[PDB]
């Protein structure tokens, strides 16, 4: 996914980041409620957030 995400800019990657944070919250609410079933989506979204933050820190200037 990093190859696709490198095309995006600092804005439109922050938007992506915030959207994955919203999705992570919603998955957390379903999971904690005990009505998620697909328990593996939490690993998927967390690693996606880590990827977006890595690309942000790369494009910051360092």
């Amino acid at each position: 996914k990093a190859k696709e995400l490198r095309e995006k800019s600092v804005e439109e990657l922050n938007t992506e980041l915030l959207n994955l944070l919203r999705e992570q919250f919603n998955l957390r609410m379903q999971a904690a409620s005990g009505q998620l079933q697909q328990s593996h989506l939490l690993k998927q979204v967390r690693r996606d957030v880590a990827r977006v933050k890595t690309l942000l820190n790369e494009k910051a200037g360092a």
Binding site: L18, L21, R22, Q24, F25, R28, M29, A32, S33
Partner: protein
């Protein structure tokens, strides 16, 4: 509190206890598991942004973890913070 990134991290789960059910039925209160370092203002902003409901007040308490036994091993569950968020009139979730 103002940052939506912080708001999306403070709230963790809803509490599913009989005391929580009675509080919701009578006092219009929702009980939540929340982060250790979440402040009352943070919980208020988080509930009133993410759940989209007006919040009257928040009471908080820290729950100490239990020393459980597993085989010969002694483990100590992690402490957690409990938030009693009293809504004004409206509740959805």
């Amino acid at each position: 509190m103002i940052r939506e990134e912080r708001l999306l991290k403070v709230l963790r789960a809803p509490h599913v206890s009989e005391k929580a059910s009675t509080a919701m039925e009578k006092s219009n209160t929702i009980v939540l598991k929340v982060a250790k370092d979440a402040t009352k203002a943070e919980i208020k902003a988080a509930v009133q942004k993410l759940f989209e409901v007006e919040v009257e007040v928040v009471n908080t308490l820290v729950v100490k973890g239990k020393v459980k036994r597993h085989g010969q091993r002694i483990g100590r569950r992690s402490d957690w913070k409990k938030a009693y968020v009293t809504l004004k009139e409206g509740q959805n979730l």
